[PDB]
């Protein structure tokens, strides 16, 4: 994977190229107003150590932070999300601790309200592949990376509430 962070808009100013997870990008650049992703799928974070707002980015040019739905110009850590091919599979539960009715999801789900008549998911289990969970339908609102693992309550995926509108598999366009 290869991503380049630039301090000013339109690929200008001081920059840094990254090829791997980095829990603290602040020693390399002071702010981020544009990004070019050359390869890989990445989760970027507002604060070091993978905290704050998160943003999912795939290959492409992002000449201003609105192109990645950024909240501001702070990008202080990043993960290169490991690539996975074949089946992505997760299970969502109506209550925490894997209780209530469970639904199994293996495709992108742009609206859990349309598909399951749910506005909230209170625990979920990611069996294969990484996913991005979005607070609102249609890949809107706050984003949260989900790697394989148990998430027995919403705090485990870093959210402030249980609202889950859509889920996207982390797949490169090809």
UniProtKB/Swiss-Prot annotation:
Glycans are attached at residue 2. Residues 1-39, 40-82, 88-128, 129-171 form the Beta/gamma crystallin 'Greek key' domain. Residues 83-87 are annotated as: Connecting peptide. Gene3D superfamilies: Crystallins (2.60.20.10). SUPFAM superfamilies: gamma-Crystallin-like. Keywords: Disulfide bond, Eye lens protein, Glycation, Glycoprotein, Repeat. It comes from the Eukaryota. Disulfide bonds join 18-22. InterPro entries: Beta/Gamma-Crystallin, Beta/gamma_crystallin, G_crystallin-like. GO terms for biological process: lens development in camera-type eye; visual perception. Has a two-domain beta-structure, folded into four very similar Greek key motifs. Crystallins are the dominant structural components of the vertebrate eye lens. This is Gamma-crystallin B. It comes from Bos taurus (Bovine). The gene is CRYGB.
């Amino acid at each position: 994977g290869k991503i380049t962070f630039y301090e000013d808009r339109g690929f200008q100013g001081h920059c840094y190229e990254c090829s791997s997870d980095c829990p603290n990008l602040q020693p390399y650049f002071s702010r981020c107003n544009s990004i070019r992703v050359d390869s890989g799928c990445w989760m970027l974070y507002e604060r070091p150590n993978y905290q704050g707002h998160q943003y999912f980015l795939r290959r492409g040019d992002y000449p201003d932070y609105q192109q990645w739905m950024g909240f501001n110009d702070s990008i202080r850590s990043c993960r290169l999300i490991p690539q996975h091919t074949g089946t992505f599979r997760m299970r969502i539960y109506e209550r925490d601790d894997f209780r209530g009715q469970m639904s199994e999801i293996t495709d992108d789900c742009p609206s859990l309200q349309d598909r399951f008549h749910l506005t909230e998911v209170h625990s979920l289990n990611v069996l294969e592949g990484s996913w991005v969970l979005y607070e609102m339908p249609s890949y809107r609102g706050r984003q949260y990376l989900l790697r394989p693992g148990e998430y027995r309550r919403y705090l485990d995926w870093g959210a402030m509430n249980a609202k889950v509108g859509s889920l996207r598999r982390v797949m490169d366009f090809y």
